[PDB]
Design a protein around this ligand. Structure first.
Ligand SMILES: NC(=O)c1ccc[n+]([C@@H]2O[C@H](COP(=O)([O-])OP(=O)(O)OC[C@H]3O[C@@H](n4cnc5c(N)ncnc54)[C@H](O)[C@@H]3O)[C@@H](O)[C@H]2O)c1
Ligand SMILES: NC(=O)c1ccc[n+]([C@@H]2O[C@H](COP(=O)([O-])OP(=O)(O)OC[C@H]3O[C@@H](n4cnc5c(N)ncnc54)[C@H](O)[C@@H]3O)[C@@H](O)[C@H]2O)c1
Ligand SMILES: OCc1cccc(F)c1F
Ligand SMILES: OCc1cccc(F)c1F
Ligand SMILES: [Zn+2]
Ligand SMILES: [Zn+2]
Ligand SMILES: [Zn+2]
Ligand SMILES: [Zn+2]
Lengths: 374, 374
């Protein structure tokens, strides 16, 4: 009924860095060819959304942020073949065009159509579907889920199980899949190995889930906020350490705890120094370290390449290394088959209009994932 | 006839940094328990030996350097089981104790008994078997092959085929195995892939051999000395580029040539800048870059961790990833079955007494490998 028409709805607009989100009346254009308009049902608050506010992550402003979500297709543009009105969908902040060199590669998932590398904050066609008082509002990662309605390119949406609980599976759109895949797909954590996980937020907890599912014997959680430790243990951490408790550097502590270095480490915070620390604390000859955290824009780390020459492997990934359109439906199906739990990540549930409270909670350290509902 | 006696012989002693080797009389003690004294037959000049002269690689002085060699066992200490007098042998600069957590790991080769990480310049028991001018002289990487006779620990020597040509197979002691393994074992180069090799000396040429053996479709050799290009092509390079011929940085050129980045890159020089460049030129989502070159002591590089977050893999290795004592005899066996060639790496042969000339040849850019014969 609203198909082919402009929709007037509420969205959370970020006009300036370091300000609250502003709930505004926006207009959402109808989808053009190969585009999909989605009615949002739930969206998670991910630290990466906060990075937009803080200036950690640079993207064109003003902007509708939000990238971890699930909704129902309101309508489709001409030529769309992979979803239909009424379908449950998860937007993909990393697209899967299926045609680029990366999409064709067996392991690669960072599709060249992504709006992450050099953000334009638009649809694939270089334009915006959002206006606020006649002013164009930028998109974010081709998703923009902090809105009652959004429009995405077809390559940035996956159809999921019609019976799926959107208020939970929205986490598969970023936090869970990133964390879990970083362990299971990128690191390829082995049975009986020792792992160290730096950062015990939503993503780091999902890394622990992945390490536990892979059969790691030891999973050492590292966080400067000790209130994070109880949930870390609940999901599989065998021990937790707070660097603030020690008079010495935590890589030393972890090297002694692990009798010469860990098998697998993960940086799930977004700091240069913890990226170097995580690399150092893996075993010098065969250890692997995976960067998951997003560091501050344009900042370089300093490291000694002898750390690598001895035989360490250092790698990073987006979205847990999952080819997004292929994997998101299977991860939902796996959730339905009770292969993993999502409830441990959800600490708060708030209506969408309370977005700023949701971010206050994240920033204060009290929440893991707040789910915003419509 | 010399068994159990102190041997008086010639060795090239390095007394101070940035000075010629001094060929003089040294005294070589008989082997103690689990030690093996070797009459040297041939030794190659590796860039790493020159790094000791230049102070790029720090090890205690005064020293008998040299680590890429082959010889014949003169005598054994009590309890030695793996070699006998008269056996042909290759000293192992990376030991294989067989007992440490690294030796027991399926992937690791950087045995914890190595003398590379925290150089002492001794035998395993922390003493030296060399005396010169009444002074004790340090060992180098438990090998010290720039001497008519040396003493090595049993874990640092492998028995090889009795009919092998030592004036060739000495290269399996470092340069060949390092380069070859970096390609075939560490990087795990795939059939049909594109490779970029930075540095076309003995080790880089060996990397090319490995890339060709792995069935790479394209192998791009990169060197600032165009005189290296012909040999590179002979051993499998499909193209060669000199950074100095281009206005854009070579990472950009290489990215263009490969339609978005190479599958595998190798730094085989030993510069911080080329380490970062080699990382950058591999495809951002699934590229792998291997550091082989030895950088100047205690210097850190600076890099943007976004190069890894997109999905790149960065690693390095000692000795091409090979478990040294297992691998060296198999590599010799393969050489005698003509599975690879060593002749292309050998540009000069000189008697040992002309060691300084051999180093001049390396420093001038004229040679790949000079073999010294005793
Ligand atoms: N690579 C990807 O695809 C991807 C996907 C999602 C999120 N991320 C990034 O992953 C990171 C984690 O996101 P999240 O949503 O879990 O965040 P979060 O803020 O919930 O978790 C970060 C945790 O790190 C801890 N921490 C902060 N400083 C620390 C320090 N010095 N030492 C130890 N712990 C410290 C905090 O106490 C917190 O628990 C962020 O940088 C985010 O942008 C990356
Ligand atoms: N990891 C290991 O186990 C291991 C083993 C052997 C050697 N190495 C190291 O590997 C490196 C190569 O050894 P080698 O014996 O082949 O040395 P080499 O000196 O013969 O070759 C190095 C090559 O790099 C080229 N080069 C110099 N600057 C360059 C620049 N900016 N760009 C491109 N090319 C440049 C030189 O012209 C030369 O051809 C050295 O650092 C050595 O110490 C490491
Ligand atoms: O949280 C996903 C994400 C969003 C923006 C930028 C990133 F690098 C990233 F990983
Ligand atoms: O050339 C072998 C070698 C010798 C000394 C130090 C090194 F890192 C190394 F790789
Ligand atoms: Zn996210
Ligand atoms: Zn693609
Ligand atoms: Zn060498
Ligand atoms: Zn060992």
């Amino acid at each position: 009924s609203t198909a082919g028409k402009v929709i007037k709805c509420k969205a959370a607009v970020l006009w300036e860095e370091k300000k609250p989100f502003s709930i505004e009346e926006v207009e959402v254009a109808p989808p053009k060819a190969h585009e999909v308009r989605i009615k949002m049902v739930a969206t998670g608050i991910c630290r990466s959304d906060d990075h937009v506010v803080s200036g950690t992550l640079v993207t064109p402003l003003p902007v509708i942020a939000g990238h971890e979500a699930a909704g129902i297709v309101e309508s489709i543009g001409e030529g769309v073949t992979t979803v239909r009105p009424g379908d449950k969908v998860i937007p993909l902040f990393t697209p899967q065009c299926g045609k680029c060199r990366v999409c064709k590669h067996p392991e690669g998932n960072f599709c060249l159509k992504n709006d992450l590398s050099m953000p334009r904050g638009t649809m694939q066609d270089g334009t915006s579907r959002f206006t606020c008082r006649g002013k164009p509002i930028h998109h974010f990662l081709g998703t923009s889920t902090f809105s009652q309605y959004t429009v995405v390119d077809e390559i940035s949406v996956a159809k999921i199980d019609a019976a799926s609980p959107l208020e939970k599976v929205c986490l598969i759109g970023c936090g869970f899949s990133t964390g879990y895949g970083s362990a299971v797909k990128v690191a390829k954590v082995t049975q009986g190995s020792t792992c160290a996980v730096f950062g015990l937020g939503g993503v780091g907890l999902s890394v622990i889930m992945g390490c536990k599912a892979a059969g790691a014997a030891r999973i050492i959680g590292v966080d400067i906020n000790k209130d994070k430790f109880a949930k870390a243990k609940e999901v599989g951490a065998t021990e937790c350490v707070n660097p603030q408790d020690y008079k010495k550097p935590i890589q030393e502590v972890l090297t002694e705890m692990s009798n010469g270095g860990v098998d697998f480490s993960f940086e799930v915070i977004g700091r240069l120094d913890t990226m170097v620390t995580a690399l150092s604390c893996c075993q010098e000859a065969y250890g692997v370290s995976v960067i998951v955290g997003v560091p501050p824009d344009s900042q370089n780390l300093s490291m000694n390449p002898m750390l690598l020459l001895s035989g360490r492997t250092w790698k990073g990934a987006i979205f847990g290394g999952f080819k997004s359109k292929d994997s998101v439906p299977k991860l939902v199906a796996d959730f339905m088959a009770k292969k993993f739990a999502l409830d441990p990540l959800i600490t708060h549930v708030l209506p969408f209009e309370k977005i700023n409270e949701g971010f206050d909670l994240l920033r204060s350290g009290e929440s893991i994932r707040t789910i915003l509902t419509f």
